[PDB]
Design a protein. Structure first.
Lengths: 112, 112
């Protein structure tokens, strides 16, 4: 619920707050709350492989968190961009039918 | 977030659980969780006029809760079905721009 909420609500206020601030004391607190909601979200759902992997890239090259992973996300979902490679997957058809569908739900859920 | 979640997720499992149970030990716990999520929701957002009003209808005629209001919701939103009656509204254009839009967001958000 609130993961979807934060994702939906961020797409408008990122460009504004990035361009505008503090001239826009609207988007800034909005994205602040959105980040807090994200923290609510993965407080129970653990992180993805990209996250610790970016921990690492930041680790050796002193790169800050937050953008190191931001350089990765793309290929990451392309790794998830799979129809049915049953090479190493475990218990696939139990609770997680297919990530692709989930992503598409996100897409149309933005109306993208 | 989770209000939208419960609303979205209920529309499928109500007809099934109503028709099927206990033959369907899927929809029943699903709607159970949905109700719990609803309780999460209005735990901070207070009730609507229909709710206490249905409290009353149940009160005099010994009618059970849950269906008394269920006989009302229709006209209720038709009461909210207003473009701009500034007859008794207070502080309208502050945080709540228009309920109609919110309802339409629900509609397309179901894809209705």
């Amino acid at each position: 619920g609130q993961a979807l909420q934060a994702l939906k609500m961020l797409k408008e206020y990122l460009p504004s707050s990035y361009a505008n601030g503090a001239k826009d004391p609207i988007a800034r607190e909005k994205v602040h709350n959105a980040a807090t909601i994200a923290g609510i979200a993965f407080a129970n759902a653990f992180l993805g492989v990209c996250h610790s992997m970016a921990h690492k890239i930041g680790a050796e090259f002193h790169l800050p968190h937050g953008l190191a992973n931001a350089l990765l996300i793309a290929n990451v979902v392309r790794y998830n961009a799979n129809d049915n490679p049953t090479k190493q997957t475990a218990f696939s058809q139990y609770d997680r039918p297919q990530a692709r569908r989930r992503y598409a739900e996100v897409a149309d859920h933005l109306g993208l």
